[PDB]
Amino acid sequence: GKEGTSTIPGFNQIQFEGFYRFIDQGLIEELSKFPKIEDIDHEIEFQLFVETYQLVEPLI
Amino acid sequence: TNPDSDPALVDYDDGIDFPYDDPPLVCCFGAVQKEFVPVVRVHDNPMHPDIYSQWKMLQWDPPEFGRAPGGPPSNVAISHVRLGGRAAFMGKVGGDDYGEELVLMMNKERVQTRGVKFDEGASTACTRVKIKFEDGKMKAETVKEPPEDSLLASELNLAVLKE
């Protein structure tokens, strides 16, 4: 937590800290804003379970 | 000529007749170490146990006892010479590399190490202790003192002491 308090902070920390915030918090926040899908009422209802989102390490 | 004799009979004499060179000599007596702050007390607000980069914060906000910590008498002798004075160090070191290094450290600082004795059968700054579990708490006892703590009264350099 005391990153820049004593030593010179990492020059890329702002880029580093932002991306981790986006992965930790910026994903579910946008996913939670995804609404339900239905026309009026039919044999159709589509929705996303936000709590079950996962990210996979790139193959390459 | 006997360092262990009572300093009340005939002095060590020798052939010192010309006046001593100014500034007056200073003798620093005790162990020789590098760093090794002796004054240690319990302090609050410790920094991170592993991240030593944060420990500078306790240098500019120090414990009140560690505001101007002292050290071994060698530091006083070394600092005295850099201030223009002449200092001679009296003590005993082992015959190992560290004893040579510590004596070399003081020699490069123009500190008179003529009063430094060498104990060949000893390891410099090395105290052999025995660990004993007494009353449920681990303790230690000094089996053999280090050469710094092993300067006999017969090894004193009376030439240094007189000057």
Q: What is the DSSP string of B71-131?
A: --HHHHHHHHHHTT-EEEEEEEEESSHHHHHHHHHHHHTT-B-TTEEEETTS-TT--EEEE
Q: CA nearest B47 in A: which residue?
A: A2
What length is written for chain B?
163
A12 shares contact with chain B (CB less than 8 Å): no
Quoted resolution (Å): 3.0
* Contact flag B56-A2 (C-beta cutoff 8 Å): no
* Experiment used for this model: cryo-EM
Smallest Cα–Cα separation from B93: which of B141, B143, B34, B48? B34
Residue B151: how many CA atoms within 13 Å on its side-chain side? 20
Q: CA nearest B56 in A: which residue?
A: A6
Give the contacts of B107 (CB within 8 A, at least 6 positions apart). Answer: B113
* CA separation for the pair B70, B62 (Å, rounded): 14
* CA separation for the pair A17, A40 (Å, rounded): 43
* CA separation for the pair B147, B120 (Å, rounded): 9
Judging contacts by C-beta atoms under 8 Å, the chain B residues touching residue A5 are 54, 57
Name residue B90's beta-bridge partners: B29
Contact B94, B128 (CB under 8 A): no
Distance from CA of B48 to the nearest CA of A (A): 10
Hey, which residues 21-60 in chain A have their CB within 8 Å of chain B?
A: none
B57 shares contact with chain A (CB less than 8 Å): yes
- Helical packing angle, B97-108 and B73-82, nearest 10°: 30
What length is written for chain A?
60
